Ligand binder design. Sequence first.
Ligand SMILES: [Zn+2]
Ligand SMILES: [Zn+2]
Lengths: 205, 205
Amino acid sequence: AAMKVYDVTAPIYEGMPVYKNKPEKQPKRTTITNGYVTESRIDMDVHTGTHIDAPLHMVEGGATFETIPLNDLVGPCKLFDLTHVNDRITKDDIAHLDIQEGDFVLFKTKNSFEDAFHFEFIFVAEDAARYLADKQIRGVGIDALGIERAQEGHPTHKTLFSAGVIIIEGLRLKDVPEGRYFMVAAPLKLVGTDAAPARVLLFDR
Amino acid sequence: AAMKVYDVTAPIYEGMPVYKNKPEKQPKRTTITNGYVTESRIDMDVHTGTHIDAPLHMVEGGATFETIPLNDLVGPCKLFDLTHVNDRITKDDIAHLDIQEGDFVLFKTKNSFEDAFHFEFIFVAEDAARYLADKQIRGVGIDALGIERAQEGHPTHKTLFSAGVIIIEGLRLKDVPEGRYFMVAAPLKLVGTDAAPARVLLFDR
Ligand SMILES: [Zn+2]
Ligand SMILES: [Zn+2]
């Protein structure tokens, strides 16, 4: 038939999976009645769930969220199946793939098949980040709450920030077949922030 | 040829326009810094800036993991130039327009040309709302923070919601020409709320 749209965003609620299970990282909803009209507020970490990372996050004085051009967050992307991988995605895991200057690449891993936080999530290794940066992709997305662990200094993030790559974290990709999509990765229009929650959709156009 | 995306969303920051200028309505960012690392929370009204308000039956009996559904927030819409209207849009302002069952319609008015909150915003009046509800459109968007004022009991919202219409408020339509668009109205995926901030994009597709 016609166009399929996939929503690859994690739902936000108190008790959701958060980073290292830290209970300070949980969102809080608050209400207030008196008469006729909802009130309600949401208090949340900007690195909650599915979200897009501003350079400010790992860089002092670093580039800030509204600085991300929408026009990179909208357009063709490639989704690769890396679910057979263990521990982490290396250079040698991705070097044979069709990845090029300008591409937005998304990596489905084992992470998408887990619903709670796991400390040993599949991440993007330093060698792989370098290879990607040197290739000059425009964007990379992963399906863990963070794109790096176990790497003193957070080199993966910085390799990628230095080379102008956008990072999307927290994606949920279990239901999406490998291949090409048109992506709309649509964040809250936060000004001056280290990241933002994003509602991400993939269209098979 | 060549696709244009129009961002029609207001930015979110402390000091931004909010309904009736009430300070309670402002968002607050709070930050902590740990060396190289910088991490933020955002505390905001779910009705901040550009936002969706959906009929209560769409988020259905508890929280569940239920969120405002996207079937109608993502797809074709009609945008109408009603910048000639004064005070309020009435039945007679829109009855001749090409509006049909299932449509999502967006109204560009004088509000688009004001950046601050104005108390006497152009709104949708009862009679126009009833016309649309009875027509069984799927959605209506307006470019003030509220779609209604000066109507005791909120008959505008009431009648739209009975008919299952979704409302978008806080659009920014100044730069967008009358016509047809593919809309992606992408809300924060907050479980169990009938309203949420959103990032709204129009493609000329
Ligand atoms: Zn991160
Ligand atoms: Zn409303």
